[PDB]
DNA sequence: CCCTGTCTGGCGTTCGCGCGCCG
RNA sequence: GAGUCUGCGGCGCGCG
DNA sequence: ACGCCAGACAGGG
């Protein structure tokens, strides 16, 4: 439902040391399929931070108690050197399709 | 002659670079002289495309050049022709002048050839603009390639051999209107120049010499060539095209990769993989829906929006300037004198809007304060200020606002203050302020899309994936095109692409069918045959056979004459599949659609959304200084023209007041429109028409000239149009 | 389409006259007060945010609804031009 | 099966039988089911769906070989360079038409439910010539100039239209592209010129009492030299539909009363009667013979308002007319200019604008008989009597069909082809010209699919003859061209009210729509098109008081329109409530003093 | 007739031929001025030439230039064409030009070309829509029926006054959902007109019942797609609004779509099933 | 308050030229840069044509609507807005006559 | 001096909308 | 108790 | 470039 890169301000920016652009990344996040186990989890914010010459996959997200990620190997990004990526990606339970413009989190 | 480069998309730019215009110095060709010039003359062969001309009053007058056409020494479009001495074809070429070409007997490239040997006694050749069946012994020269007969822009049409010249024109033109999508896919079926286009055009970034990759940033790919050298290759991250299309180079090479000379390091604004890509491949059922596709309407599946398939970034550069008035310089500050802080949030940086801020229509993009009157204060506004707070900022609110229509998010901002670096500030202009905004254009009902052949149309309804036509296997179609728009226009090429497209889907492969030499009906029947096993083969093994549905459509199909009666449904569906059509279920009912419906991968692009698309509706607004007719521009849309043609329409009808209204209350009656507004504000009945300014201005203009125009009464006596300003003193 | 436009068409000598009537009627419907109607009781004009059209939505929508009935009268010269506006103000209150 | 015509007709009927709005419901009903059934029908174009006929290969080959014979026939010296060409063209022109009915014959017999075919047969989409280019073959496409190529285009769109056959086809597309766009502005212009003269015409009346009607003809003279024939059902319907009988006519049994507006069903009766042979003409009020100087009445115009009942007074028929003529043009003026059957917009311009046509035909100024001579240089067709002959020089290029022997009435074709209005007027009179223009105008429109009511052409043509010359003065000197009715004014009061019969002898003048608009009474309307420079010069010199009548002029002022609600007939109409009718009577009762 | 001669040249008003501030200090004045100066200079220079001493050659030569000048403002081009100095070899728009032709002044009046309450967007079929109505964007409606809405806002609690109601809508993020209810109420029974690209016949314009919808596109009924020659490959139609109760009257009684089913050309209908419907009803 | 029923074009009498005329433009003085105000009597002077200001006058002796129809004792300024400026006409007294090209070059010379 | 013919001189040639540029 | 001033002529292109 | 109308002048009795 939402994402926050630490040094990024808008959706059309590019992060150094990171091949992909914020837009391509946010796109690949739509591809992320998470599975929570109970109503108590209405909105869960997944946190992830990786640095340097490493590939950022979806299993790199620090695990949360009642939530599970069935899309581990999904490719988030390719970090070069001095590649600093610290983001917070929101996740919610809903129905149908909701334009990013309709909710505006 | 020199104009704005049209860079909707790279191919557009490119085309606008080479098109030959007639109008110009004036010495050459004028505007209303042309029925002989506008025609496509014989010699236009390989020199000038006979298709690339515009639709409209200025037609046949402007045209892009051909494939290999090259201007030699003096402005003569010569065309490549290969030599053939005796019954022997050479790989030698001679760019020949328009004149010399008449001296020889040239033949077509489709001529059967074993290498250097002509293969058929009676083979086609064309003397001088005259079709002639010559012998292998007279063939003095042969054409290089069918492509040379046309332009680059046209060459890009899949099966151009099966489309009518008129709708083909619309084709080639539409491509020049293609807008770069963040997501760029190459056609499932190509012609052979998609690659060449992004290459000779400067879309993608190629590797100079062989080497390896060092760093792969989202901003730079520093490659290390094997010669001991390394170059940093910045990439135009997100730049503003003239026409507001995004131009970004997306790296396609991973870290540390030995690159071959001339391989894509990054993809241009619209390339997938070194291939020209605009709009995207999409599965399409070619059937009729309710009325959603009546004459030229298009039904889209909401599914295309789920996955950003038709999404385009649009950057607009609004700009504001701090002018120096003799009343007091117009300052740029966060202070918007009269009413709220809620409108000042996004204006975080004192005056300028904060980057990454969502700006909706009517929000302050930049703030500015000028002075209230022309030279004097206000006697009535003086008491108002004093009552609530005399101490009020005399400055007027003239702040760049988001014009009606749409704004997106603020991506970049530019401010040029007093001590200018190496900038050229116009006189009076104290300082300027640029505000780039971008927005995601999710394909909506208002947009228009069209395929390379000529099928144009607007989206009438975004259907939920829930009930649109679905294939035996859960795979649902994305767009549903109306069949009726294909017979009238003549372009079977679209129906041929769909079929080839069908095979490519289940066979998982793209193709490249040349201009006149491309794919043939048999060959496509072949691939389709290969597709039936991918489609129905897996179905056999996955565990299930044919439906009651699939069988009923077969009955109605054999009663039709699409399948030979007496063969097994397995064998019949194949025959039917080879026909390019399969069975489809309604999706809304689950029942089949009586009769096989073709389906396939058709390449469809989105056309550029001009400020003409983004609707213009006006209530009240500015007015012209000399004529008193309504006009807009910046933020007030500006009124629509009512033309004589339309006047007559009302004239026909008994719409007297409606017409009167149009000529008075709505446009020229200065006193009428004022009282009109006010009356409506109160819920009153508009006053009766005063004379229109156009009339008054007419009279005085006529008066500027000797002539005396005086209105008269029942008995020939005066009456006064100018209410009381013509009497003297 | 609209209510008995045919019926209405047949009630006049000329198409364009019906328009005049309906318009002038809708005019006086608002001006001298909107209750200047001849058929409000049992079945009358209605909108649905509530049944609130009884008071002031569309003027001529009523006019036609009236003319469709046989209560009103439209002549080339039925009642002296000035004395009508006078007698009308005297008998209809709302302002 | 329900075709666009069967349904067209159902609407029409529904309109007349049950009522307007009720019909509207019907429209939507069709609209909904036709849309739904369509989806389910699963009709879709498959490249295949375009079905090529098996006979295509035969007819092509049969015509192929025949081409050889013509070639061998020329390689010997038998056929002149020309004969060869005209002969080849003929071959394909027929062969192509053969493939045509062939393709359809295939669908008709083998594939009644073919997506493409079904769309073409149902009033949906598709044309016979178009289908031909997909399954059959688009065979002949002219060169740049106009001479059609000797080589046809053997391919279809189904199969690869080759490299060169495309280029050769481009010439025609560019020309079409250029011609089509030229027809568009030439059509709007014509509508500006059509409006420029008929704008003032508006229905404002009382049954005009001048019963001088127009007689609508049901039979036409020369298709084949001389054979009487029933005109087409369409053309005849165009002329008598919703008209008003100028006089009573008893035909097959029923009694067609006077003034009665004939319905389409009546117009059907008359034809059937004509079939039996009871009526050759039809008395009908027409704008061609109305008395109302500026404007036309209810009985002479007819039925057609947008509604099916008599025309409602105050309807801008002038424009209504002018429009019905300018729209079909844009559609048929493109083909008619393009071609044997029909010459178009250029002719429609030569028509509304009185002028001397391309191939002129010497008309017979005298009505006696025709005869012809033999001498070498120039032929000669003479209309003679034992008293005098009207010598008609017919150079080498003209062909004459009237023969040594019989009668030739005034203005009759003595040469073959087109005729000059001015001459026919002089020879056969005005009544004839009007009638000629009208039908000669419809010829073009009929031959291209458009079905416009004669009414409209009449309205305009009238204005073409709204003027006349003078040869016996009274108030103002002889050579002068003035408004015909304004002379009917002078003449009427100089003989009836004030004595001294000073006959104002005039001469009918035929003027082109353009000329009439150019030179009209008011100047305001003239200040619009021709020369604002001239128009005003004269209008000034002579203090001209533009009486405001007519919509053009009255529009510039921004004043209400003289027609419509501004229609003097309904500008004034008051509404009453029985409550206010008694209150007004109460005001009359208070008038009794003491 | 003694007036045909000019001894007094009328000058056109000051504002009409605009002396305006352009940019940075650039000034734009109507061409007529340049011609007027010509005349003024000539006449003056003549007077002085006669008063100084008058050598025959030079008095005529001037009166000549004078004569031509006088032609210039009246009509340019009838004899030679005056030009603004090296910049644009363009005919200074003389009085004659201003009055004649295509986009002249006699044509600006006649065709009256710019409506205050107008709109124009792309059209899109609206299959469920009835001939009676049309789909008009609410966003479009808002501006179109702004004044009509402002008042309606005050009749309810959405806004205190007009000016209040105005600022309330100046920004898009400020619109209370209550406003749409107001507008939806304002257009209750009013109707607007729709215009097609070339207005060829009276049906080139028709009146429909606006049914406010979301988005940019304007929903047009399919049956009327034949009246206006309009397909949906992107054709755009304009839209107007009848302001007086009279204008609305005529517009919904005689100009509405549904009431004009038959064509003025022929007694044939123009609401016949089209390309799609016939295909369905045939099969 | 009457209805305009007839319009009429008529030639111009030199006296009528002057009669529609307010003031006489006797000098080629457009507007002098320092002050974007009309220079002298020239083409844009406000007397000859009209109030450069709303309801206010020249010097400001009378400045609102109460006395809308009177002229300033020390300065001649009657006022409404500046529309009077766009409706007023001026005349140029030509030395030696010249003729209308409209009457002279029309195909039929109305004068010839 | 008359009538006839020939080059000659003036006007017109859809509508609306977008965008962008320029003194 | 709100209202001024700018956007013109032309050119190019593109849509229906 | 064209087409079209309307025109004013010059040549052959
Ligand atoms: C009334 N007119 C007619 O129909 C007939 C009579 C006559 C005529 O008057 C013609 C023309 O006036 C043609 C004008 C041209 C070529 C206009 C261009 C400038 C057009 O080009 C484009 C660029 O712009 C506009 C419109 C469309 C265009 C093509 O895209 C524009 C108008 C014409 O074609 N005729 C034929 C000729 C051959 C021969 O001599 C024959 C006897 O008569
Ligand atoms: N120059 C122009 N002037 C006026 N209208 C134009 C135009 N160009 C296009 N159009 C309008 O838009 C339409 C475009 O023409 P087309 O659709 O090609 C004609 P068509 O013969 O109907 O082809 P089609 O039936 O195969 O669709 C016309 O009906 C016309 O009204
Ligand atoms: Mg279209
Ligand atoms: Mg079309
Ligand atoms: Zn009559
Ligand atoms: Zn003063």
H/E element holding D337? helix D317-338
Note whether B411 and B509 are same-domain residues: no
Q: How far is it, in rounded angstroms, from Cα C91 to Cα A31?
A: 74
In which residue are the tokens 């000098």 written?
F27
CATH number of the domain bearing residue C74? 3.90.940.10
Nearest alpha carbon to residue D205 among D574, D568, D460: D568
Ligand 2 atom having least distance to the Cα of D334: 21
Q: How far is CA B406 from CA B181, B316, B446, D242, E119, in A?
A: 19, 10, 14, 54, 16
C-beta of residue C44 within 8 angstroms of C-beta of residue C11: no
Residues 6+ apart with CB under 8 A from E15: B625, B626, F49, F82, F85, F86
* Collapsed DSSP state (helix, strand, coil) of residue F110: coil
The alpha carbon of residue D265 and the mean position of all alpha carbons in its chain are separated, in whole angstroms, by 23
Take residue B550 and report the two structure tokens written for it: 């699939």
Sign of CA dihedral B198, B201, B203, B209: positive
Structure tokens at B429: 């202009």
CATH classification of the domain holding B289: 2.40.270.10
Query: What are the tokens at E147?
Result: 């004044």
Query: What is the Cα Rg of chain E in Å?
Result: 29
B264: helix, coil or strand? strand
Nearest-CA neighbor of E116 among A97, D503, B619?
A: B619
Whether residues E246 and C27 touch (CB distance < 8 A) is answered with yes
- Assess contact for B651 and E152: CB atoms under 8 A: no
Helices (H) and strands (E) in chain D, counts: 20, 17
Report the residue count for chain C.
95
CA distance D157 to D141: 15
Q: Which residues of D touch C4 (CB under 8 A)?
A: 21
| Residues in Cβ contact with B151 at an 8 Å cutoff, skipping those fewer than 6 apart | B15, B49, B51, B52, B63, B64, B65, B66, B67, B172
Three-state SS for D120? helix
CB B650 within 8 A of CB E250: no
Say yes or no for a CB contact (<8 Å) between E66 and F96. Answer: yes
Residue E280 · residue D37 · CB < 8 Å: yes
**Residue B338 and residue B341: Cα distance in Å, rounded?**
10
d(CA D192, CA B644): 9
Q: What single DSSP character describes residue B639? A: P
CA distances from D236 to D245, D257, D324, D326, E135 (A): 15, 20, 18, 21, 42
Distance, CA of F44 to CA of F23 (rounded, Å): 11
- Cα–Cα–Cα angle for B624, B628, B629, rounded to 5 degrees: 75
Q: In total, how many domains does chain A have? A: 1
Residue D185 CA: nearest ligand 1 atom is 26
SS3 E66: helix
3-state SS class at B106: strand
Question: Would residue B60 be called left, alpha or beta, if left means φ above 0 and alpha means ψ between -120 and 50 degrees?
Answer: left
Q: For D141, what's the count of Cα atoms within 13 Å in the CB-facing half-sphere?
A: 23
Expressed in Å, this structure's resolution amounts to 3.0
Query: Which DSSP string do the residues of D43-111 spell out, in sequence order?
Result: ----TTTSPPPTTHHHHHHHHHHHHHHHHHHHHTT-S-HHHHHHHHHHHHHHHHHHHHHHHHHHHHHT-
Q: What distance in Å separates the CA atoms of residue D423 and residue D210, rounded to the nearest whole number?
A: 28
| Furthest CA-CA distance within chain B | 104
Radius of gyration, CA atoms only, chain C:
14
Nearest CA-CA partner of B525 in B505, B504, B554, B503 = B503
In terms of domains, do B419 and B458 share one?
no
Mapped onto helix, strand or coil, the DSSP state of residue A14 is strand
> Is the same domain home to B485 and B411?
no
Dist CA D469 CA A35 (whole Å): 97
B189-190 and E133-134 strand pairing: unpaired
Crossing angle of helices E245-253 and B656-663, in 10° steps, is 130
Q: Which atom of ligand 2 is nearest to the CA of B56?
A: 1
Q: What is the H or E stretch that residue D128 is in? A: helix D128-134
| Residue of least CA–C1' distance to H2 | B381
CA-nearest of C74, D518, B390 to F108 is D518
Are the CB atoms for B638 and B621 separated by under 8 Å?
A: yes
Portion 188-217 of D in contact with B at CB < 8 A: 188, 192, 195, 199
B683 φψ region: left (φ > 0), alpha (ψ -120 to 50), beta (else)? left
Which chain A residues have a beta carbon less than 8 Å from that of B358? 104
User: What is the secondary structure of B172-209 as a DSSP string?
Assistant: HHHHTTB--BSS----SEE-S-HHHHHHHTT-SEE-SS
Angle at Cα B674 formed by Cα B669 and Cα B679, nearest 5°? 120
Beta-strand relationship, E133-134 and E205-210:
parallel
CA angle D306, D310, D316 (to 5 degrees): 55
Q: How far apart are CA F77 and CA F75, in angstroms?
A: 6
For residue E177, report the phi and psi dihedrals to the nearest 5 degrees.
-60, -20
Provide the CB-side half-sphere exposure for D63 (13 A, CA).
Answer: 23
Judge whether residue D526 contacts strand I, using its CB and a 7 Å cut-off: no
Q: How many CB pairs under 8 A join C and E?
A: 50
Beta-carbon count within 10 A of B72 CB: 11
Q: In terms of Cα–Cα distance, which of E186, E123, E197 is closest to E155? A: E186
Cα–Cα distance between D412 and D361 in angstroms, integer? 9
Closest to B312 (Cα-Cα) out of B442, B219, B408, B484: B442
Q: Which helix (H) or strand (E) holds A49?
A: strand A43-51
φ, ψ of residue A4 in degrees (nearest 5): -140, 105
- DSSP SS3 for D170: helix
User: Which residue(s) pair with F31 in the sheet?
Assistant: F38
Q: What is each CA distance from D425 to B398, B638, D388, D430, D436, in whole angstroms?
A: 72, 53, 20, 5, 10
Question: Would you say D290 is a known binding-site residue?
Answer: yes
What does the alpha-carbon distance between residue B39 and residue B668 come to, in Å, rounded to a whole number? 45
Give the integer Cα–Cα distance in Å for D109 and B67. Answer: 47
Rounded to the nearest 5°, which phi and psi values hold at B265?
A: -90, -35
Range of the domain at B544: 278-310+443-607
**Rounded to the nearest 10 degrees, what angle do helices D163-198 and B165-175 cross at?**
90
Experimental determination approach used: X-ray
Cβ neighbors of E277 (< 8 A, separation 6 or more) are D30, D31, D34, D35, D38, E222
Q: How far is CA E112 from the centre of its chain?
A: 6
CA distances from D93 to D58, D89, D101 (A): 16, 6, 13
CA dist B628 and B513 (Å) reads 59
Can you count the helices (H) and strands (E) in chain B? 16, 34
Provide the domain limits for residue C63: 1-95
B228 has which bridge partners? none
Quote the number of domains for chain C: 1
Measure Cα distances from B533 to A41, B286, B557 in Å. Answer: 46, 23, 21
Say yes or no: D145 contacts chain B, CB-CB below 8 A.
no
CB of D562 closer than 8 Å to CB of D551:
yes
Q: What are phi and psi of D130, to 5 degrees?
A: -75, -55
CA gap B482, D43 in Å, rounded: 10
How many other β-carbons are positioned within 10 Å of the β-carbon of residue B597?
30
Is E233 marked as binding a ligand?
yes
DSSP B482: -
Q: Note whether D1 contacts F: Cβ–Cβ < 8 A.
A: no
What string of DSSP letters covers E135-173?
Answer: B-BHHHHHHHTHHHHHHHHHHTTT-SSHHHHHHHHHSGG
Facing B685 at nearest CB: one of C15, C19, C30: C30
d(CA B35, CA D175): 8
* Token pair in block for residue C51: 């049944």
**Which amino acid residue places its CA nearest to atom 28 of ligand 2?**
E229
| CA angle, B545 then B551 then B552, to 5° | 155
Q: Which helix (H) or strand (E) holds D26?
A: helix D20-41
CB neighbour burial string for B538-554, b if at least 16 within 10 angstroms, e if fewer: ebeeeeeebeebbbebb
Q: Which residue has the tokens 């044309």?
A: D127
Q: Which nucleotide is nearest to B3 (CA to C1')?
A: H12
Nearest ligand atom owner, CA of D295? 5
C-alpha distances in angstroms, B217 versus B252, B360, B507, E35?
11, 33, 35, 65
* Residue A68's CATH number: 2.170.120.12
From the Cβ of B685, is strand H under 7 Å away? no
Extended beta strands in E19-129, E state: 20-21, 27-28, 118-125
Q: What CATH number is associated with residue B219?
A: 2.40.50.100
Residues facing D381 on adjacent strands: D372
Q: Which residues contact D160 (CB under 8 A, 6 or more apart)?
A: B161, B162, B516, B520
CA atoms of F79 and B299, how far apart (whole Å): 63
Q: Are strands D255-256 and D249-250 parallel, antiparallel or unpaired?
A: antiparallel
Exposed / middle / buried, residue E157 (Cβ in 10 Å: 0-12, 13-18, 19+): exposed
Chain D residues in contact with F102 (beta carbon < 8 A): 533, 536-537
Nucleotides on chain G that have an atom closer than 7 A to a protein CB are 9-21, 23
Q: Hey, what are D401's tokens?
A: 């069909």
Which position has the token pair 């790296």? B251
One domain, residues B462 and B334: no
Pair of tokens at residue B477: 């179609």
- Please report where in the chains the tokens 């009669």 appear, as a residue: F19
The pair of structure tokens assigned to D527 is 């200040």
Using a CB–CB cutoff of 8 Å, tell me whether E33 touches chain F.
yes
Residue of F nearest to E71 (CA): F101
For residues E205 and E194, give the distance between their C-alpha atoms in angstroms, rounded to a whole number.
5
Number of residues that this document lists for chain A: 105
Give the C-alpha separation, B349 to B364, whole Å. Answer: 12
The dihedrals phi and psi of F5, each to the nearest 5 degrees, come to -105, -20
Region for residue D419 given its phi and psi (left: phi exceeds 0; alpha: psi -120 to 50; beta: otherwise): beta
Taking each helix axis from N to C end, the angle separating D163-198 and D345-352, rounded to the nearest 10 degrees, works out to 20
| CA angle, D112 then D116 then D120, to 5° | 80
DSSP string, D532-564: HHHHHHHHHHTTEEEE--SHHHHHHTTPPPSST
Residues B482 and B567 in one domain: yes
Q: Are strands E20-21 and B19-21 parallel, antiparallel or unpaired?
A: unpaired
- DSSP reduced 3-state for B260: coil
Find, among B126, B327, E222, the residue nearest to D30 by Cα: E222
User: Running DSSP on this structure, what letter comes out for residue B382?
Assistant: H
User: CA-CA distance, B481 to B501, in Å (whole number)?
Assistant: 15
A35 class by beta-carbon count within 10 Å (0-12 exposed, 13-18 middle, 19+ buried): exposed
């Amino acid at each position: 439902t939402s994402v926050y890169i630490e040094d990024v301000l808008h959706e059309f920016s590019t992060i150094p040391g990171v091949k992909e652009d914020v837009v391509e990344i946010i796109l690949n996040l739509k591809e992320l399929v998470v599975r929570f186990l109970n109503p108590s989890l209405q909105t869960v914010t997944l946190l992830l931070k990786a640095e340097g010459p490493k590939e950022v996959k979806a299993r790199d997200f620090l695990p949360v108690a009642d939530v599970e990620i069935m899309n581990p190997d999904l490719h988030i990004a390719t970090l070069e050197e001095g590649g600093r990526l610290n983001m917070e990606v929101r996740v919610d339970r809903g129905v149908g399709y909701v334009p990013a413009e309709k909710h505006g989190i | 002659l020199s104009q704005f480069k049209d860079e909707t998309n790279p191919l557009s730019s490119l085309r606008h670079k080479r098109r030959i215009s007639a109008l110009g110095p004036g010495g050459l060709t004028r505007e209303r002289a042309g029925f002989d010039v506008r025609d496509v003359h014989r010699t236009h062969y390989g020199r000038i495309c006979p298709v690339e001309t515009p639709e409209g009053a200025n037609i046949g007058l402007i045209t892009s050049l051909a494939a290999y056409a090259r201007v030699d020494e003096l402005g003569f479009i010569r065309t490549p022709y290969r030599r053939v001495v005796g019954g022997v074809v050479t790989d030698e070429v001679v760019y020949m002048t328009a004149t010399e070409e008449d001296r020889y007997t040239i033949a077509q490239a489709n001529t059967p050839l074993e290498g250097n040997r002509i293969a058929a006694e009676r083979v086609v050749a064309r003397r001088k603009g005259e079709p002639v069946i010559v012998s292998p012994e007279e063939v003095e020269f042969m054409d290089v390639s069918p492509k040379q007969v046309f332009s680059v822009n046209t060459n890009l049409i899949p099966f151009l051999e099966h489309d009518d010249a008129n709708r083909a024109l619309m084709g080639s033109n539409m491509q020049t209107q293609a807008v770069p999508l963040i997501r760029a896919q190459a056609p499932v079926v190509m012609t052979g120049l998609e690659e060449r286009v992004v290459r000779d055009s400067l879309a993608a970034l190629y590797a100079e010499e062989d080497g390896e990759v060092a760093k792969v940033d989202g901003n730079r790919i520093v490659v290390r060539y094997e010669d001991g050298r390394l170059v940093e290759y910045p990439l135009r991250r997100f730049y503003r095209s003239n026409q507001g299309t995004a131009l970004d180079q997306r790296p396609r090479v991973v870290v540390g990769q030995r690159v071959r000379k001339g391989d894509l390091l990054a993809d241009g604004p619209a390339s997938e993989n070194g291939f020209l890509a605009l709009g995207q491949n999409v599965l399409v059922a070619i059937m009729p829906f309710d009325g959603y596709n009546f004459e030229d309407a298009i039904v889209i599946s909401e599914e295309l929006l789920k996955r950003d398939f038709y999404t385009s970034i649009h950057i607009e550069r609004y700009e504001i300037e701090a002018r120096d008035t003799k009343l007091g310089p117009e300052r740029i500050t966060r202070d918007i004198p009269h009413l709220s802080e809620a409108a000042l949030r996004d204006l975080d940086e004192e005056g300028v809007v904060r980057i990454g801020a969502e700006v909706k229509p009517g929000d302050i993009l930049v703030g500015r304060t000028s002075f209230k009157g022309e030279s004097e204060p206000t006697p009535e506004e003086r008491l108002l200020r004093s009552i609530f707070g005399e101490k009020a900022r005399d400055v007027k609110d003239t702040s760049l606002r988001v014009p009606p229509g749409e704004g997106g998010i603020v991506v970049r901002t530019v401010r040029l203050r007093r001590g200018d670096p190496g900038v050229e500030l116009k006189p009076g202009v104290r300082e300027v302020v640029r505000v780039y905004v971008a927005q995601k254009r999710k394909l909506q009902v208002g947009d228009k899309l069209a395929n390379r052949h000529g099928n144009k149309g607007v989206v009438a309804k975004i259907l939920p994936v829930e009930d649109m036509p679905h294939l035996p296997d859960g795979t649902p179609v994305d767009v549903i095109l109306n069949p009726l728009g294909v017979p009238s226009r003549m372009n079977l090429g679209q129906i041929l692409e769909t079929h080839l497209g069908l095979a490519g889907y289940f066979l998982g492969q793209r193709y490249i069918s040349p201009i006149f030499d491309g794919a043939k009906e048999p060959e496509i029947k072949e691939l389709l045959a290969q597709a039936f096993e991918v489609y129905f083969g897996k179905r056999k093994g996955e565990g299930f056979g044919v439906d009651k549905r699939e069988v009923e459509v077969l009955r109605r199909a054999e009663k039709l004459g699409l399948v030979t009666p007496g063969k097994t449904p397995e064998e019949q569906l194949k025959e039917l599949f080879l026909q390019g059509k399969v069975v489809l279920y309604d999706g809304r009912t689950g029942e089949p659609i009586e009769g096989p419906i073709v389906v396939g991968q058709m390449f469809i692009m989105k056309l550029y959304h001009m400020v003409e698309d983004k609707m213009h509706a006006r209530s009240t607004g500015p007015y012209s200084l000399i004529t008193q007719q309504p006009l807009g521009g910046k933020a007030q849309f500006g009124g629509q023209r009512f033309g004589e043609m339309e006047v007559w329409a009302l004239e026909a009808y008994g719409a007297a007041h409606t017409l009167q209204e149009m000529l008075t209350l709505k446009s020229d009656d200065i006193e009428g429109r004022n009282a009109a507004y006010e009356a409506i504000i109160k819920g009153e009945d508009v006053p009766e028409p005063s004379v229109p300014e156009s009339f008054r201005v007419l009279v005085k203009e006529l008066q500027a000239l000797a002539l005396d125009v005086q209105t008269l009464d029942e008995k020939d006596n005066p009456v006064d149009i100018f209410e009381g300003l013509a009497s003297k003193r | 389409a609209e209510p008995g436009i045919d019926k209405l068409f047949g009630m006049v000598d000329s198409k364009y006259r019906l328009t005049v009537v309906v318009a002038k009627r809708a005019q006086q419907l608002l001006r001298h007060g909107f209750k200047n109607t001849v058929l409000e009781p049992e079945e009358r004009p209605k909108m649905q945010t509530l049944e609130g059209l009884f008071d002031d939505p569309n003027a001529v929508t009523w006019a036609m609804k009236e003319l469709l009935t046989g209560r009103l009268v439209f002549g080339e010269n039925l009642v002296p031009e000035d004395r009508l506006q006078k007698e009308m103000e005297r008998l209809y209150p709302v302002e | 099966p329900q075709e666009k015509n069967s349904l067209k007709d159902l609407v029409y009927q529904a309109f007349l039988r049950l009522g307007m709005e009720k019909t509207a419901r019907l429209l939507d009903a069709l609209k909904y089911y036709g849309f739904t059934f369509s989806t389910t029908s699963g009709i879709t174009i498959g490249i295949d769906d375009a079905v090529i006929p098996e006979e295509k290969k035969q007819y092509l080959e049969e015509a192929d070989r025949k081409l050889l014979q013509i070639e061998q026939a020329y390689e010997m010296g038998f056929l002149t360079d020309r004969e060869r060409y005209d002969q080849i063209l003929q071959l394909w022109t027929e062969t192509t038409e053969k493939v045509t009915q062939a393709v359809f014959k295939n669908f008709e017999e083998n594939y009644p439910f073919n997506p493409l075919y079904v769309m073409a047969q149902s009033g949906a989409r598709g044309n016979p010539q178009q289908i031909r280019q997909l399954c059959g073959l688009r065979g002949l496409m002219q060169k740049p100039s106009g001479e059609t190529f000797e080589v046809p285009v053997r391919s279809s769109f189904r199969e690869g239209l080759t490299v060169l056959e495309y280029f050769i086809s481009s010439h025609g597309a560019r020309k079409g592209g250029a011609d089509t766009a030229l027809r568009t502005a030439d059509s709007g212009y014509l509508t500006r010129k059509l409006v420029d003269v008929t704008h003032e015409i508006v229905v404002r009346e009382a049954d005009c009492g001048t019963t001088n009607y127009i007689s609508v003809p049901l039979f036409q003279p020369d298709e084949v030299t001389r054979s009487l024939r029933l005109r087409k059902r369409a053309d005849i319907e165009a002329g008598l539909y919703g008209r008003v009988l100028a006089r009573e006519v008893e035909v097959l049994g029923v009694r067609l009363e006077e003034g009665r507006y004939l319905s389409m069903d009546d117009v059907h009766l008359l034809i059937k009667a004509a079939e039996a042979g009871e009526i050759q003409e039809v008395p009908v009020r027409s704008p061609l013979t109305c008395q109302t100087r500026y404007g036309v009445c209810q009985k002479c115009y007819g039925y057609d308002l947008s509604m099916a009942r008599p025309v409602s007074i105050g309807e801008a028929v002038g424009i209504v007319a002018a429009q019905s003529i300018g729209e079909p043009g844009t559609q048929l003026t493109m083909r008619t200019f393009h071609t044997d059957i029909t010459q178009g917009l250029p002719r429609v311009i030569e028509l509304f604008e009185a002028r001397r046509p391309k191939a002129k035909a010497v008309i017979s100024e005298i009505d006696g008989v025709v005869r012809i001579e033999e001498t070498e240089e120039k032929l000669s067709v003479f209309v003679e009597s034992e008293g005098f002959s009207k010598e008609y020089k017919l150079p080498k290029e003209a062909r004459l069909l009237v023969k040594d022997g019989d009668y030739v009435e005034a203005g009759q074709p003595l040469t073959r082809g087109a005729i000059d209005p001015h001459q026919l007027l002089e020879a056969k009179g005005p009544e004839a010209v009007e009638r000629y223009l009208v039908e000669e105008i419809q010829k073009v429109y009929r031959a291209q699919g458009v079905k416009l009511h004669d009414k409209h052409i009449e309205i305009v043509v009238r204005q073409m003859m709204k003027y006349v010359e003078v040869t016996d003065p009274g108030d103002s000197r002889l050579l002068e061209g003035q408004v015909l009715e304004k002379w009917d004014v002078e003449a009427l009061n100089e003989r009836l009210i004030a004595e001294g019969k000073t006959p104002v002898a005039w001469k009918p003048l035929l003027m082109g729509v353009t000329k009439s608009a150019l030179s009209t009474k008011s100047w305001l309307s003239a200040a619009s098109f021709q020369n604002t420079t001239h128009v005003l010069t004269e209008a000034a010199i002579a203090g001209k008081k533009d009486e405001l009548i007519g919509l053009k002029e009255n529009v510039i002022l921004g004043r209400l329109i003289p027609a419509g609600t501004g229609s003097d007939f309904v500008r004034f109409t008051q509404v009453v409530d029985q409550k206010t009718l008694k209150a007004i009577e109460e005001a009359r009762k208070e008038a009794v003093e003491a | 007739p003694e007036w045909m001669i000019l001894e007094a040249v009328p000058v056109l008003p000051p504002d009409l031929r605009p002396m305006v501030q352009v940019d940075g200090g650039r000034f734009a004045t109507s061409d007529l001025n340049d011609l007027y100066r010509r005349l003024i200079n000539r006449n003056n220079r003549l007077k002085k030439l006669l008063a100084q001493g008058a050598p025959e050659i030079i008095i005529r030569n001037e009166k000549r230039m004078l004569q031509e000048a006088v032609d210039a403002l009246l009509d340019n081009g009838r004899r030679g064409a005056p030009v603004t100095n090296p910049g644009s070899d363009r005919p200074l728009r003389s009085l004659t030009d201003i009055l004649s032709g295509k986009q002249g002044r006699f044509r600006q009046n006649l065709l009256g070309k710019r409506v205050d309450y107008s709109g124009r967007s792309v059209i899109v079929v609206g299959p469920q829509l009835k001939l009676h109505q049309c789909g008009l964007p609410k966003r479009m409606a808002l501006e179109l029926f702004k004044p009509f809405l402002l008042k309606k806002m005050e009749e309810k609690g959405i806004a205190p006054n007009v000016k209040a109601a105005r600022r309330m809508l100046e920004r898009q993020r400020d619109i209370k959902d209550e406003v749409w209810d107001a507008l939806e109420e304002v257009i209750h029974g009013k109707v607007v007109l729709l215009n097609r690209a070339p207005t060829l016949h009276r049906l080139g314009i028709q009146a429909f019942q606006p049914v406010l919808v979301e988005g940019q596109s304007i929903q047009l009924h399919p049956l009327v797609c034949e009246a206006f020659n309009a397909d949906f490959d992107g054709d755009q139609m304009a839209v107007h609004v009848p302001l007086s109760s009279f204008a609305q009257a005529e517009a919904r009684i005689q100009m509405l779509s549904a009431h004009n089913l038959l064509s003025p050309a022929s007694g044939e209908p123009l609401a016949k099933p089209s390309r799609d419907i016939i295909l369905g009803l045939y099969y | 308050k009457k209805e305009v029923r007839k319009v009429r074009i008529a030639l111009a009498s030199p006296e009528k030229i002057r009669s529609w005329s307010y003031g006489e433009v006797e000098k080629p003085e457009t507007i002098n840069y320092r002050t974007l105000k009309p220079e002298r009597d020239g083409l844009f002077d406000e007397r000859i044509f009209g109030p450069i200001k709303d309801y206010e006058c020249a010097c400001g002796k009378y400045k609102r609507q109460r006395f809308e129809g009177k002229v300033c004792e020390r300065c001649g300024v009657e006022v409404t807005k500046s529309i009077v400026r766009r409706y007023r006409m001026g005349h140029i007294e030509l030395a030696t006559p010249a003729a209308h090209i409209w009457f002279v070059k029309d195909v039929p010379s109305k004068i010839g």
